[PDB]
Structure 1
């Protein structure tokens, strides 16, 4: 392991997945791809398929009590987890991604990003045996109240979200707990819509206050529950009241 890029806060993420090639979407492209090449982020996959012993490499099994779907077969999945934990050494927290988990939000991303090592277990079918949660999983997390064909997209979502908090990965995330303000680039006029003159003014302080007021107004109109989680600054209370008066 070598290179010139400061990597003091580098993260290691082990992944248990039946489809490790999915992870190329994050390891080979964009900002996450650069993090991996610069050794700020390492993503290491184990496939339960490689832990099977039968001729057909069976990775699913029938649920007790019947019902329609399959579960991940215990022995191959358990063996893959044990191999990832041995590789990771001490301090690796094991995360299972499921709709039954703790709801991920940006605060939870920053809590997760304090871990120098994670193992992300990706369930396929109707998920994993309850007893493996009890014996192998440190924390269960959901990316949101929907059901996907597997935990791989949730795992990749968490990796990407945490990676942004690794110093050096980026070249301001829900700034102030608010929805982000509108942004504008060239051209000055688009389908008769003009860039707000304040953004053209060069007045750094008036621009700051316009963006903060817009963020407060958009949070209030779209996601008012997000305001209730906040103790607004004096300046923020005044800009919201001005945006609420102007709306009315």
Structure 2
């Protein structure tokens, strides 16, 4: 690898997936695509299909005890995982994306971002054999309490979220553990709705305090449990009380 872009904190992400082409959505486009071109982020995919030996390249298998659904076939998946681990060498944490995993939040994203090397295992069908968790997986993580057709979209969501914390990928993420304040661009009037005059004022301290107050107000109204997680500053306590008094 060569180039001029500072990449001390670069991340390597190994991916195990039956649909590696899905990952073009992050490696070919936008901020993540730029990260890849600039060697800040590398996404390398192994497909269990390439580790099959039967004529029809079988990658699913029947669950012991029956059921409607299939599981990922153990041998092709295990061989793909082992190949990824050999490529990564020492220090790679292996993650399985599952609804039974630890719930991802921004704090967890920043913990994951400390790893220089990750391997992300993408389950299809009803998922993977329990014993592969014990033998191959370091951590299970969920992107949220819902079921998807595969772990690819969860894996891409985690890649994108961690990529933002790689220095140089971006040009403020839930600033203060709070929801975003309202923001505005041109025009000054839209369908009779005006930009709050403080944002046109050029008064940097007044704008900062208005934005903080609005963030505290929105977080209180939409997600009050997020405020319970915080030890508010004196300034935040006062702006929230002002917002709550104005609301009432």
Fold conserved between structures, TM > 0.5: yes
Pairwise CA distance, 1:29: 0.0
Pairwise CA distance, 1:26: 0.1
User: Any idea what SS the aligned residue of 1:179 has?
Assistant: coil
Pairwise CA distance, 1:44: 0.1
- Aligned counterparts of 1:67 and 1:58: Cα–Cα separation in 2: 19
**TM (normalized to structure 1)?**
1.00
Pairwise CA distance, 1:55: 0.0
- Aligned counterparts of 1:48 and 1:209: Cα–Cα separation in 2: 53
Name 1:192's counterpart in structure 2: 192
Pairwise CA distance, 1:97: 0.0
Listed one character per residue, the Cα deviations across residues 205-243 of structure 1 (whole Å, up to 9, x for unaligned) are: 000000000000000000000000000000000000000
- Aligned counterparts of 1:245 and 1:182: Cα–Cα separation in 2: 19
Number of residues of Structure 1 aligned to a counterpart in Structure 2: 248
Listed one character per residue, the Cα deviations across residues 49-79 of structure 1 (whole Å, up to 9, x for unaligned) are: 0000000000000000001000000000000
Name 1:45's counterpart in structure 2: 45
**TM (normalized to structure 2)?**
1.00
Listed one character per residue, the Cα deviations across residues 177-210 of structure 1 (whole Å, up to 9, x for unaligned) are: 0001010000000000000000000000000000
Unaligned runs of 5+ in 1: none
C-alpha RMSD over aligned residues: 0.2
- Aligned counterparts of 2:113 and 2:192: Cα–Cα separation in 1: 44
- Aligned counterparts of 2:20 and 2:89: Cα–Cα separation in 1: 21
Pairwise CA distance, 1:33: 0.1
1:22 matched to 2:22: yes
Unaligned runs of 5+ in 2: none
Pairwise CA distance, 1:39: 0.1
- After TM superposition, which residue ranges in structure 1, 4 or more long, deviate above 6 angstroms? none
Pairwise CA distance, 1:13: 0.1
Describe how 1:125-204 pairs up with structure 2 within 5 A.
125-204=125-204
Describe how 1:77-156 pairs up with structure 2 within 5 A.
77-156=77-156
User: Any idea what SS the aligned residue of 1:95 has?
Assistant: strand
User: Any idea what SS the aligned residue of 1:75 has?
Assistant: helix
Listed one character per residue, the Cα deviations across residues 84-133 of structure 1 (whole Å, up to 9, x for unaligned) are: 00000000000000000000000000000000000000000000000000
- Aligned counterparts of 2:67 and 2:20: Cα–Cα separation in 1: 28
Pairwise CA distance, 1:165: 0.1
- Aligned counterparts of 2:195 and 2:210: Cα–Cα separation in 1: 13
